[PDB]
Amino acid sequence: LIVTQTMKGLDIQKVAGTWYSLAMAASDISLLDAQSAPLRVYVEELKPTPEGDLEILLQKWENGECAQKKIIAEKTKIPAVFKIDALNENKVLVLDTDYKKYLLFCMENSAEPEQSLACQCLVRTPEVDDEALEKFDKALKALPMHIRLSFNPTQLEEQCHI
Ligand SMILES: CCCCCCCCCC(=O)O
Numbered sequence: 222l223i224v225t226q227t228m229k230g231l232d233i234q235k236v237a238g239t240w241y242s243l244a245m246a247a248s249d250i251s252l253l254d255a256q257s258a259p260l261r262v263y264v265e266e267l268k269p270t271p272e273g274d275l276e277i278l279l280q281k282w283e284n285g286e287c288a289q290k291k292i293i294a295e296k297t298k299i300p301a302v303f304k305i306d307a308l309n310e311n312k313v314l315v316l317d318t319d320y321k322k323y324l325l326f327c328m329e330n331s332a333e334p335e336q337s338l339a340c341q342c343l344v345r346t347p348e349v350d351d352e353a354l355e356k357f358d359k360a361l362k363a364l365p366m367h368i369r370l371s372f373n374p375t376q377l378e379e380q381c382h383i
């Protein structure tokens with residue numbers, strides 16, 4: 222795979238707290254298409270553990286309902302890159318953040334050709350941050366994305382952005 226945008230000097234303890242999935246993009250349409258597509262996940266909160274792992278609370282559509290999830294992303298030697306345990310190796314990379322307004326991250330299946338990738342623009346507040354979106358869109362220029370979604374403040378205050 223392919224994301225070579227990573228934040229230098231990341232302090233993971235400082236991303237802790239409330240986030241909103243303002244926008245999402247993926248390499249393949251089917252990753253985000255359906256309400257229950259695999260990477261259509263809505264971030265609720267980031268909880269870095271005191272040993273530097275990253276616990277992720279999120280919502281996902283799974284029954285005919287919005288199910289809650291807890292994902293644990295384990296630290297690696299690279300401060301901006303974490304690994305989620307599965308039948309396959311898949312990583313979380315933090316591309317950019319200011320901790321207090323926005324965070325840009327991607328998730329990719331490692332590895333390899335390249336294939337499969339989804340990125341989000343996270344913001345602290347249920348508001349459309351055009352500047353965070355502009356940085357998201359800048360980051361995505363380097364990537365082979367084929368679907369992009371964006372949410373309005375009303376959806377951002379609903380479960381699964383309904
Ligand atoms: C630093 C932002 C962390 C958010 C990463 C969300 C990972 C969800 C991957 C999944 O379970 O499909």
Ligand SMILES: [Cl-]
Binds near residue numbers: 296299300303
């Ligand atoms: Cl790490």
